[PDB]
């Protein structure tokens, strides 16, 4: 099975809401039993959380159950995945300068998926549209990503 992580800073707000998009996407795409959702944070601060109360609220009103319980990344996330995908472009660059030479191929930005919103990067949800905006990037991200998945080895 495909195992795919979703990265950010702390694990409590963008990348589990990531994680839960993406999860649903697979769903409705009935692709559940070929892939694996996880999350995780480059700093270890937060460890142990639930996510962001706010954002679990949000997610759930639209369909996303946002359950993920923060964890830091560790070595062997980048033996272990497929592929990682950073929230914003300071994780990218974080996450390359840990990654193993032999694994960096593996790390993509998430935001490189969207097709329909130009953003650079998925905000901080800091009032409580900041929460909506977030989802809606990862709608957009998520459905290209599980298309592009399907369709071979990502290369955008």
Do not use: W
Not at 70 to 80: A, E, G, L, M
Not at 108 to 122: G, L, N, P, Q, R
């Amino acid at each position: 099975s495909m195992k795919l992580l979703f990265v950010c800073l702390g694990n409590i707000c963008r990348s589990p809401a990531a994680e839960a998009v993406m999860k649903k996407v697979i769903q409705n795409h009935h692709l559940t039993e070929k892939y694996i959702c996880d999350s995780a944070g480059t700093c270890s601060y937060h460890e142990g959380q639930q996510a962001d109360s706010r954002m679990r609220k949000v997610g759930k009103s639209r369909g996303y159950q946002v359950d993920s319980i923060s964890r830091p990344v560790v070595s062997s996330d980048f033996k272990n995945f497929d592929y990682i995908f950073a929230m914003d472009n300071d994780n990218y660059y974080e996450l390359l300068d840990r990654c193993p030479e032999q694994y960096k191929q593996k790390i993509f930005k998430m935001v490189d998926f969207c097709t329909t919103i130009k953003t650079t990067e998925v905000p901080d949800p800091y009032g409580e549209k900041g929460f909506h905006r977030v989802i809606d990037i990862l709608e957009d991200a998520c459905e290209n990503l599980i298309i592009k998945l399907e369709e071979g080895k990502l290369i955008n």
